[PDB]
Amino acid sequence: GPKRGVALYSYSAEFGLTKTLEDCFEDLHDMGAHGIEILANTHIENYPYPTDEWVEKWWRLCDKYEIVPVEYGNWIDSHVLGDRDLTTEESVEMLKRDIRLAHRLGFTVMRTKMPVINDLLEPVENWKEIIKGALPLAEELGIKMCPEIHTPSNLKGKLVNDFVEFIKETGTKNFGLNIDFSVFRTSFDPNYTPNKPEDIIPLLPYVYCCHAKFIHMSDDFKETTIPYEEVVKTMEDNGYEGYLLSEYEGADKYDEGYEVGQTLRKHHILLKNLLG
Amino acid sequence: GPKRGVALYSYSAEFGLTKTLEDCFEDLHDMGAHGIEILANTHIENYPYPTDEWVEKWWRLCDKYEIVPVEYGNWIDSHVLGDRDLTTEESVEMLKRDIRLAHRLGFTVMRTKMPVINDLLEPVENWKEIIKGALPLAEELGIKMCPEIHTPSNLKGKLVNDFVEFIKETGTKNFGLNIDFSVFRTSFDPNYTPNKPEDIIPLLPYVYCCHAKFIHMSDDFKETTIPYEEVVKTMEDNGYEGYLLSEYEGADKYDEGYEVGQTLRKHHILLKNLLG
Amino acid sequence: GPKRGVALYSYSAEFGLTKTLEDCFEDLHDMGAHGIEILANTHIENYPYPTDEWVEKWWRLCDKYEIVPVEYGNWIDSHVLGDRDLTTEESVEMLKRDIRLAHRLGFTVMRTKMPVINDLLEPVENWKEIIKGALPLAEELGIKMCPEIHTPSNLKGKLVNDFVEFIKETGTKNFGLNIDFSVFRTSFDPNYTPNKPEDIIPLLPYVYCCHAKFIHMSDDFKETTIPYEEVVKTMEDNGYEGYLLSEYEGADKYDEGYEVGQTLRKHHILLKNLLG
Amino acid sequence: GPKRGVALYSYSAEFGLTKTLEDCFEDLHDMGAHGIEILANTHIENYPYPTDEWVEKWWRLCDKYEIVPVEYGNWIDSHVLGDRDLTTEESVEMLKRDIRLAHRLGFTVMRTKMPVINDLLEPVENWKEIIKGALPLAEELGIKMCPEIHTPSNLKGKLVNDFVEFIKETGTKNFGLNIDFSVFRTSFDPNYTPNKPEDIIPLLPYVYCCHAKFIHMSDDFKETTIPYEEVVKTMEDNGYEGYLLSEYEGADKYDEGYEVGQTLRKHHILLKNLLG
Amino acid sequence: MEKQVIQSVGFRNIKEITGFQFKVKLPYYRGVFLSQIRPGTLFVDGQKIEKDQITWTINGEEYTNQEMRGDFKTHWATTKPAVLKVKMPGGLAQGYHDLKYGFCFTSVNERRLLIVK
Amino acid sequence: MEKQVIQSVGFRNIKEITGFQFKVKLPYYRGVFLSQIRPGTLFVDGQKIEKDQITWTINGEEYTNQEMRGDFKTHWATTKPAVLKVKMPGGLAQGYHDLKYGFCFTSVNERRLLIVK
Amino acid sequence: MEKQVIQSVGFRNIKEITGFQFKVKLPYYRGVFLSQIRPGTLFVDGQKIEKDQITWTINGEEYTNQEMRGDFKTHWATTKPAVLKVKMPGGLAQGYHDLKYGFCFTSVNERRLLIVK
Amino acid sequence: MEKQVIQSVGFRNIKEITGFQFKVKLPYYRGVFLSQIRPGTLFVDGQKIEKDQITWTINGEEYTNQEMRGDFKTHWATTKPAVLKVKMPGGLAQGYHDLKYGFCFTSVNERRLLIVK
C-alpha cells in the first residue's frame, strides 16, 4: 500500500543553518519515514556537478538511515533568462542533466516544475517538446517525470486533462502526475474549488507520487484543514502504492524557536494511524 | 558452510602504489570473495585514530561491494620499545583500542599477533593477563580474538595446546584460533612436520577463521603444495562455517609486472570448485 | 609595539552553531585583528589527533586571512580522572602532545591552564616537574608556555611570584606569563584588589601574551570598567611587543540575537585608537 | 630577467600513477623552479567544475611550495564534435569558462591550443571571432591568451604573422605568443627550417611565455640539440622577463624505470647556469 | 545542531525494543575527556531512570559509566553530540514525552519531544 | 551563516581603498542561476549607490550585472552567500553604517554594521 | 591504477547474467569530452563484439555511442577509468579470456584476464 | 610514491644552508610505531654521516632518535614517507650524489640523485 516519507522542503528554514543533510536523514529515520524528496537546487552540493565523493556520501547516508530516494524535485527553467526564453534544446539538455543526476542518486520519480505563462498555471507552449526530448533518457534510466498538481488547479480542470491526454497520446510510462493534497483543502483564492477524494480515482493510474501537504496538526495528531482520512482511504482502496511525502509550508516555519521536526512527527503519527 | 574471502596482505606490494582501498574492495568483488581481512597498521587511515568521515567511507565501501569485514589483523606490540617491555596495562589499553576499532568497522574476528620470546613462537609470559584484561570488552562488543597458528607450529604442539587449555580454563567464547594452512604444506625448517587434515578436527570448535594460504596456483586452478581438497573437505564435513581467507606470501609479489589479483582469482576459482 | 588579535573564546556561543572556523578567521580579518588565540579542545578537528588534511586547511586559512597564530590555549588536566591524579609522566606526555600540535599549527605561545588545589588558585604541587619535563621540547620547537594570570590573583600576590621565581631559577626563555586585563578592573570577590597599570612593569620581561579582556564597550568605542588607556600606554612605553587578544566573557554572549562580532569590532576600534 | 619553471606535461607518464599534484609541486620546489604550467584537462579535479575545497587546496599547495602559476594550458575544442563544428558562441563560452578558471587559480597566461584545418597548422577560420569574444573577459581578469608556436612553424612564417597582425590590429595586451623552443632545434619534417635565436627578437614584445623544450640533456648538464645558450642570451638581452618552462616530450618518458624528475633537474641546472 | 542541550534529532526507540535513545550536546565552550563527564539521572515523564541504565555513544563507540570513569584519552567534542542509549524494555510509547536529563563535568536540561512507534 | 540576509562577516573596505564589500545570503528555499538574480540599489547611511557600482562574487568568480544577466549556467547555492563589492573611492568611514540593500529573483534588507579602518 | 589500458580490476560478469564489463583508462595526457571518444570493436577470445553491444559508464553515468557522440560537456578524466559494459547473454565463461579492445579519440590494446563465475 | 625506499622527490638542501633532506618510505607491509624504528648511518658520496646528525619528520612532526626511541604512540604509515633532515653545514653541492642509507625496524638502500643549488 501507500508508503510515507518527507519532502526536505519542510526543513527549508533549518537546512544549512541548524540542520545538515545527515540531520535531515536522521530526522526522517526517527519518524520511520523512509521516503525522501529532495530539491536539486538545494540539497546537492556543487550542483549541478556534484563530485563522486559527495555521491558516495549520499549513498552512505541513504544506507545508514534506510532512506529510500523517492522524488527528485527539479525545475524546467525556461524563463531562467530575462532577455529571451530557452530553446527547446537547452531545456532538454538541462532536463537530461537532472534526469541523469536523479538516477545517479537512486531516485525513481522526478517532480518537474514547469514554468507557467498564464495564471491558470498553464505550462509553456513547448512543454510537450521538452518532455518528449527527455522521455527516451528517462525511460532508459527508469525515471518517471511528474509535474505537480497544486492549488488552485483542479483534478477536473484543463491542466490535469492536458497532462492526461499527453500521457494517453504518447502511451508513456515515464510521465505522470504528482498530486499535492492542497487540492483537497476544505478549511481556510477565487479559482480554487475543493476536490472531493473520489476525484483522485480516475487519475490514480498516472499518479506516481503525492505531496502529503498539511497546514496545521493538532496535539491530538489530527490534520484540521484536509480530509486526510477519506483521501488516504481512497488512495489505498484503489491500489495506490506510491509515497505520501509530508510537506509543511506554514509561514511559522521561519518563526524563532519553531520545531518543524515535531510537526512532521505529529503528521507521521497521523499517517501511521491511517496507513498502518 | 565455509565462506571465502581475501586477506589484503596479498596486496602488500600493490597497496598504496597502484591499488587504493576501493580497488582492493572491487578486486574482491570481482572474484565474489566477500570476506575481507585487513591489517590495522596498514589499511586504516590516520591509524590508530581514524576520523568519522573515514569510517563512513569504509562503511560505504563495504556496502557498495558487498564486503563482509571478517578479520581485523592487529599486533600486541609488547616489544614495541627497546629499553623495556610494555606493562600489562599498556598492552591491554592498546588491545582495547584495537578491539573498539575492529568493532567500529564491523569486524567480528581479531587476528591478534602475539610477540614471541623463544623460537618455538612461545608468547610473552603475560599474554594470558593481556588477553584476560581485554576479554570483557571483546565480549561486550562481540569480538573474537584469535592468535594465528602458523608454520612451523604444529596443531599438536605445545603452543596450540596452551591456547586450547586457556580457552577451556576461562570457558571463553571470544578467544579462539586462526589456522594458517601452511601447517598442511607437503611440497617444498627443521621443526616443521606437515599436519594431516584430520589434525584440524579436535580444534574446529575453537577455530573462528582460517588463512587459506597458498604457495603456487597452476593454470589448471590447482594448488600444488597443500592438500587443499582434503583440508577443505575436512573443515566442511565437521561443521566449520567461518571464512577461508586467501593469503599470498610469495616473493614474486614484488616482481615487476606481477598481477597478484590473477593469482587470487585462480585461488578462488579453486575454492569455488571445492566449496560450491 | 603591541599588536592585536582575538581569542576565539569570544565566539564560544557562535562557534559550531552559526560560525565555522573560516567565519571566525574572516571576522578577525574584517577588524584587521591578525593575532588569533584558539582553544585546543574546541577549534581543532579530531583533537587531539588532527589529520594532515585538516592541518593543511588550517594553514590555508591562516594564509588567506593573514592570520598570525599567537596563542594556543590548552589545559594541564591533572585532575582529568576522578579516582586519582595523573602522574607527572602522564601530564608531561599530554603537554608534549599539545606542544607539538601548537608548533605544528604555527603557534608561538601556549596558554597552559594549570589545575588548582586551593581557592587562591595555587597550582598542583608538581606543576614545576610537569613544566620542566615539557621545557626541552618547548625550547627545541620555539614554544613559550604561559599560565594565565586572572582575577582574583594579584600581580603582586604569591602566585605571580612563584611563577617569576621559577623563571629566574630555571633561567628559561620558554616559560612566562599571560596577563588577563581583569586584574586591572576598577568598575563593578573578596580577594580581588585592582592593580594599577604600573604593577605590570616589573613583569613585562616575562609577559609573552595578554588577554585584552573587556566587560562592556560603549557606543563611543570606550571600555567602561578597565583603565585601558593607562594599561596600554604602560605596556607600549615599557617595550611590550606581544599581542593583546580581545576576550569577551559577558553572559549576554548567549543571549538571543547577540552579535559578539560587533562588540569585538568596538573593542578593536578602541585598541586601534590606543595602539595606532 | 627570465624566470624558470616546469610544465607538468613533463610528468605525463607519472601523474596519477606514481606522482600526485603535491608530488609535482614538491618536485618543482626541489629544483627551485617556481613557474608552473598545468593542463586544464589533466590537473584540475572534477574539471571543468572544481569544488571550492579543491581550489583552496590548490592555493595551499601554491603557498606551501612557493609555486607561481604561470601558464594555464587549455584547448579551443571547436572540432570536439564529429557531426559539426561548434558555433562561435559555444567556443567563446568554453573559452570564458577556461579564462575564469585560470584566473581563479592565479594563472596569468593561458596557452590556448587552437584547432587546425590544414597541415600548415592554420587555425580555424573563426579563431579571431572566438578570441575577440573572449578578450573582454581576459582583459577584465588580467589573463593573457597565447597560442603556442611549435614545430614545424617558423617565426617568420604565415602563422606567426597572422597572430602578430591580429595583435597589432586589435591593439590588445591580452593576446600574445607562447614560443616553443623546438623552433630552434638544429640536431636531429620537410616544412621545418631551424630559426636562429635572433629571429625571436621582433616577436619579444608579444611573447608572454616560452616552453623551454629540450630533447636530450647530457650528464654535463648541457642540451645537445638546441642552441640554448644563444637563445636564452638573446631573450635576456632584449628584455624578456616571462618564464621559461621546461617541457620534456621524449618517448622514453614512458620507459620502465625512467626518472623524468632527474632529467628536469639536469635541464634546470642548465637554466641556472644560463640565467643566474 | 540546536541551541538546546537535548537534541530533538535522534530521539527514538531502540530495536525487540530494548529501550530508547536521545542526543545531548556538550553545554561547554571546550571539549572534555570522557573521564570528566559525570552522568546523572534521567527523568522521562517524571519516571526516574538511573545512571546504570544509560550508556554513552561518543565517536561511534559505546561506553558505560564504569568505562567512561577511567577514559581520559577519548575526547568529546562540543560539535558532536553524544548519543545516550537508555535500557527500557518496551521502549517509549507514541506521543509526547517530557525528558529531564542532568549531567555535569569536572575541571539539568528539559525537553518535550515526540516518539513515533 | 546567519539569519539575516546581509551577513555581518565580510563587511570591510577593499584595498588604495577602492570601495567596500558585504555578504548577502540567498533568502530563498532553492538556489538560483545568476540570470535569475535582479540586483537592486544599495543605500549606505541613506546615500544611494546604484546597481552599476556593485559586482557579485559567486563561487569565487566576480560578475557584473551585464555578465549575470546572461548566465544561466552558474548556480548560486543558498548555503554560500554572495560577496558584493561596491566601488566607492575611499571606502567607508570607521564606525556604524546602516546598510539597506534590495534585490530580487525571478522564477529589501536592513543591517547596522561596524567598519574598522 | 595500472599501466595497461585495459584494467584487470572490474573485469566480471554482469547480473540473470546479461553480459560482462571491463575498465579502460584513457591512454592520453589530457582528459577528453565524450564526443571525442571513438569506441571501436571488442574481441574476446577472437570472437568479435561490435560497437553497439558496449556502453560506456563515465562519472557514474552510462552512455551509448549515440549519446556520447553529441556529449561535449561530460569530461573523461585520465585518472578515472571508464567502465565498458558489454551485452553478451550468459556472460563469459570461467577461466582465461584474451581481450582485445580498440578505441580512439579525436583532437588497440590486449589483455589476458581471468573470469570467476 | 615510488618503488625505491629512498624517494627522489624531496631531495634538496635545507636553508643559511644547514644541511639537506631526503624522503624514505617504509619498506614493510605494515606501519610501525616510532619506537620500532632503528635509524642507521647515512653515506653520501662515501662520506659517512652518523645517526645523531639526522632527524625524522613523520606526520609533520620532527623527532630525534632519543625522542623516537620512547615513542610508541606515533605511527609511521607505509603510505606516508618519512622526511630525514641531515645536519650538514653548507648542504650538498650541485650535481649527482650517491646516497646509501640503512635503517631497520623491530617486531640498506642506494640511490643516485641530483641536487640543484
Q: At what angle do helices A158-170 and A127-141 cross, to 10 degrees?
A: 50
Q: Which three cell numbers stand for residue F63?
A: 560578475
Name the phi and psi angles at G86, rounded to 5: -100, 125
Bridge partners of residue C142, in order along the sequence: none
**D4 touching H, CB under 8 A?**
no
Q: Which amino acid is located at H34 in the chain?
A: L
Bridge partners of residue G44, in order along the sequence: G47, G99
Query: Is residue A76 a contact partner of residue A130, using CB atoms and an 8 Å limit?
Result: yes
CB–CB of F1 and A16 under 8 A?
yes
Residues 6+ apart with CB under 8 A from A140: none
Cell 582528459 found at = G31
Give the mutation candidate from G76, G78, G104 for the D interface (greatest D CB count, under 10 A).
Answer: G78
The span from the CA of A176 to the CA of A192, in Å, is: 22
Q: Which three cell numbers stand for residue G56?
A: 560506456
First to last CA, chain G: 24
Q: Is D191 helix (H, G, I), strand (E, B) or coil?
A: coil
Query: Is residue B15 a contact partner of residue B24, using CB atoms and an 8 Å limit?
Result: yes
CA dist G27 to A171, D120, E112, G70, Å? 44, 27, 61, 21
Which contiguous run of DSSP H or E holds residue A70? Answer: strand A68-75
For H11, nearest residue in chain D (alpha carbons): D30
The span from the CA of D32 to the CA of D6, in Å, is: 10
Q: What is the DSSP letter of E23?
A: E
**G46 touching A, CB under 8 A?**
no
Question: Which chain A residues touch E117 with a CB distance below 8 Å?
Answer: 32, 272
The span from the CA of H43 to the CA of H97, in Å, is: 10
Which contiguous run of DSSP H or E holds residue D246? Answer: strand D243-248
Cell 567534542 found at = E77
Residues 6+ apart with CB under 8 A from C263: C10, C217, C248, C250
Name the phi and psi angles at D183, rounded to 5: -75, -5
Q: Which three cell numbers stand for residue H38?
A: 632503528
Region at G72 (left for phi over 0; alpha for psi -120 to 50; beta for the rest): alpha
Bridge partners of residue D75, in order along the sequence: D113
Chains B and H touch (3+ CB pairs under 8 A): yes
Residues 6+ apart with CB under 8 A from B136: none
Q: Is A150 helix (H, G, I), strand (E, B) or coil?
A: coil
Query: Is residue A81 a contact partner of residue A90, using CB atoms and an 8 Å limit?
Result: no
Rounded to the nearest angstrom, the minimum Cα separation between H61 and chain C is: 7
Residues 6+ apart with CB under 8 A from F41: F48, F49, F50, F51, F101, F102
Q: Which amino acid is located at F36 in the chain?
A: Q
CA dist B45 to B17, B53, B102, F42, G38, Å? 15, 11, 14, 50, 39
Which contiguous run of DSSP H or E holds residue C53? Answer: helix C52-64
CA angle B90-B92-B98, nearest 5°? 110
Domains of chain F and any CATH numbers: 6-115 (2.60.40)
CA dist C39 to C9, C11, C23, C204, Å? 7, 11, 16, 24
Q: Which three cell numbers stand for residue A149?
A: 498538481
Name the method of structure determination: cryo-EM
Query: Is residue A152 a contact partner of residue A189, using CB atoms and an 8 Å limit?
Result: yes
Rounded to the nearest angstrom, the minimum Cα separation between G94 and chain A is: 30
Query: Is residue H86 a contact partner of residue H92, using CB atoms and an 8 Å limit?
Result: no
Bridge partners of residue D212, in order along the sequence: D246
User: After what residues is chain F interrupted, C–N > 2.5 A?
Assistant: 15, 107
Q: Which three cell numbers stand for residue G2?
A: 595500472
Query: Is residue G76 a contact partner of residue G31, using CB atoms and an 8 Å limit?
Result: yes
For C42, nearest residue in chain E (alpha carbons): E30
The span from the CA of B44 to the CA of H80, in Å, is: 13
**Strand ordering across the sheet containing G61-63:** G6-14, G19-24, G82-87, G54-58, G61-63
3-state helix, strand, coil in chain A (%, to 5): 45, 20, 35
**Strand ordering across the sheet containing H61-63:** H6-14, H19-24, H82-87, H54-58, H61-63
Q: Which of E95, E105, E117, E111 is nearest to E22 (CA)?
A: E111
Q: Which of D257, D214, D268 is nearest to D13 (CA)?
A: D257
Q: Which three cell numbers stand for residue D126?
A: 573563426
For residue C89, say whether it is annotated as part of any ligand binding site. Answer: no
Query: Is residue D120 a contact partner of residue D161, using CB atoms and an 8 Å limit?
Result: no
**Strand ordering across the sheet containing A148-149:** A144-145, A109-113, A68-75, A35-39, A3-7, A243-248, A207-214, A177-180, A148-149
The count of other CB atoms within 10 Å of the CB of residue B267 is 26
CA dist D117 to A17, D131, D155, Å? 54, 17, 20
Q: At what angle do helices D88-104 and D127-141 cross, to 10 degrees?
A: 30
CB–CB of A262 and E116 under 8 A?
no
Residues 6+ apart with CB under 8 A from C80: C86, E33, E35, E36, E72, E106
**How buried is C126 (Cβ within 10 angstroms: 0-12 exposed, 13-18 middle, 19+ buried)?**
middle
DSSP string, B1-40: --EEEEEGGGGTTTBTTTB-HHHHHHHHHHHT--EEEEEH
Question: Which chain A residues touch G61 with a CB distance below 8 Å?
Answer: 100, 103-104
**C254 touching B, CB under 8 A?**
no
**F66 touching A, CB under 8 A?**
no
Subunits with 3+ Cβ pairs within 8 Å of D are: A, B, C, F, G, H
Q: Which of A105, A163, A96 is nearest to A133 (CA)?
A: A96
CB–CB of D41 and G79 under 8 A?
no
CA angle F96-C9-E61, nearest 5°? 135
The count of other CB atoms within 10 Å of the CB of residue B218 is 10
The span from the CA of E82 to the CA of F78, in Å, is: 29
Query: Is residue H6 a contact partner of residue H109, using CB atoms and an 8 Å limit?
Result: yes
Residues 6+ apart with CB under 8 A from H22: H6, H7, H10, H11, H83, H84, H86, H99, H101, H113
Residues 6+ apart with CB under 8 A from C257: none
**How buried is A22 (Cβ within 10 angstroms: 0-12 exposed, 13-18 middle, 19+ buried)?**
middle
Q: Which three cell numbers stand for residue D256?
A: 620502465
H95-105 and H109-115 as β-strands: parallel, antiparallel, unpaired? antiparallel
Subunits with 3+ Cβ pairs within 8 Å of E are: A, B, C
What is the resolution in angstroms?
Answer: 2.5
For A54, nearest residue in chain D (alpha carbons): D51
Chains G and D touch (3+ CB pairs under 8 A): yes
The span from the CA of A233 to the CA of A275, in Å, is: 8
Counting Cα atoms < 13 Å in the Cβ hemisphere of G96 gives 9
Query: Is residue A209 a contact partner of residue A243, using CB atoms and an 8 Å limit?
Result: yes
Q: Which of E113, A216, H72 is nearest to B86 (CA)?
A: H72
For residue D247, say whether it is annotated as part of any ligand binding site. Answer: yes
Feature table: binding site of A: 148, 180, 211, 247
CA angle H109-H113-H117, nearest 5°? 140
Say which of C29, C150, C216, C268 is annotated catalytic. Answer: C150
User: After what residues is chain D interrupted, C–N > 2.5 A?
Assistant: 188
Residue E100: alpha-carbon gap to chain centroid: 10
**Minimal Cβ distance to H30: which of B39, B45, B81:** B39
Domains of chain D and any CATH numbers: 3-275 (3.20.20.150)
CB–CB of A32 and E8 under 8 A?
no
**Strand ordering across the sheet containing F61-63:** F6-14, F19-24, F82-87, F54-58, F61-63
Rounded to the nearest angstrom, the minimum Cα separation between C50 and chain B is: 9
User: After what residues is chain H interrupted, C–N > 2.5 A?
Assistant: 15, 107
Q: Which amino acid is located at A266 in the chain?
A: K
F6-14 and F19-24 as β-strands: parallel, antiparallel, unpaired? antiparallel
The span from the CA of A47 to the CA of F75, in Å, is: 7
Q: Is D172 helix (H, G, I), strand (E, B) or coil?
A: coil
The span from the CA of C97 to the CA of C81, in Å, is: 18
C residues 169-198 lying closer than 8 A (beta carbon) to D: none
Residues 6+ apart with CB under 8 A from H57: H63, H82, H83, H84, H85
Say which of D34, D43, D103, D150 is annotated catalytic. Answer: D150
Q: What is the DSSP letter of A216?
A: -
Q: Is A139 helix (H, G, I), strand (E, B) or coil?
A: helix
**D52 touching F, CB under 8 A?**
yes
Rounded to the nearest angstrom, the minimum Cα separation between F51 and chain D is: 18
**Minimal Cβ distance to H9: which of D23, D266, D272:** D23
CB–CB of F106 and A79 under 8 A?
yes
Cα torsion angle, E70, E74, E79, E81, sign: negative
DSSP string, D91-148: HHHHHHHHHHHHHHTT--EEEEE--BSSSS-PBPTTHHHHHHHHHHHHHHHT-EE--E
3-state SS string over A3-14? EEEEEHHHHCCC
**D3 touching C, CB under 8 A?**
no
The span from the CA of B63 to the CA of A63, in Å, is: 8
**A65 touching B, CB under 8 A?**
no
The span from the CA of D4 to the CA of C263, in Å, is: 49
Q: Is B169 helix (H, G, I), strand (E, B) or coil?
A: helix
E19-24 and E6-14 as β-strands: parallel, antiparallel, unpaired? antiparallel
Q: Is A233 helix (H, G, I), strand (E, B) or coil?
A: helix
The span from the CA of B227 to the CA of B230, in Å, is: 6
CA dist A138 to A147, D99, D216, Å? 14, 34, 55
Q: Is C253 helix (H, G, I), strand (E, B) or coil?
A: helix
Residue ranges in chain A assigned as alpha helix (H): 21-31, 40-43, 52-64, 88-104, 127-141, 158-170, 228-237, 260-275
For D30, nearest residue in chain H (alpha carbons): H12
Residues B42-75: b if buried by 16+ CB within 10 A, e if exposed: bbbbbbbbbbeebbbbbbbbbebbebbbbbbbbb
**B250 touching H, CB under 8 A?**
no
Question: Which chain B residues touch G116 with a CB distance below 8 Å?
Answer: 30-32, 265, 268-269, 272
Q: Which amino acid is located at E112 in the chain?
A: R
Chains H and F touch (3+ CB pairs under 8 A): no
**F7 touching A, CB under 8 A?**
no
Cα torsion angle, D116, D118, D123, D124, sign: negative
For G97, nearest residue in chain B (alpha carbons): B262
Query: Is residue C200 a contact partner of residue C234, using CB atoms and an 8 Å limit?
Result: yes
Query: Is residue G25 a contact partner of residue G81, using CB atoms and an 8 Å limit?
Result: yes
Give the mutation candidate from F3, F32, F72, F76 for the A interface (greatest A CB count, under 10 A).
Answer: F72
First to last CA, chain E: 24
The span from the CA of C18 to the CA of F1, in Å, is: 5
The span from the CA of H17 to the CA of H90, in Å, is: 5
Give the mutation candidate from C56, C59, C94, C100 for the H interface (greatest H CB count, under 10 A).
Answer: C100
Subunits with 3+ Cβ pairs within 8 Å of F are: A, C, D
Name the phi and psi angles at A176, rounded to 5: -150, -155
Cell 577593499 found at = F14
Query: Is residue D149 a contact partner of residue D155, using CB atoms and an 8 Å limit?
Result: yes
Q: What's the alpha-carbon Rg for chain A, to the nearest Å?
A: 18
Question: Which chain D residues touch B17 with a CB distance below 8 Å?
Answer: 18
CB–CB of C42 and E78 under 8 A?
yes
Query: Is residue D138 a contact partner of residue D110, using CB atoms and an 8 Å limit?
Result: yes
Chains F and C touch (3+ CB pairs under 8 A): yes
Say which of B34, B43, B103, B150 is annotated catalytic. Answer: B150
Q: What is the DSSP letter of A53?
A: H
Region at C221 (left for phi over 0; alpha for psi -120 to 50; beta for the rest): left
The span from the CA of A146 to the CA of E18, in Å, is: 42
C150 noted as active-site residue: yes
The span from the CA of C128 to the CA of C11, in Å, is: 32
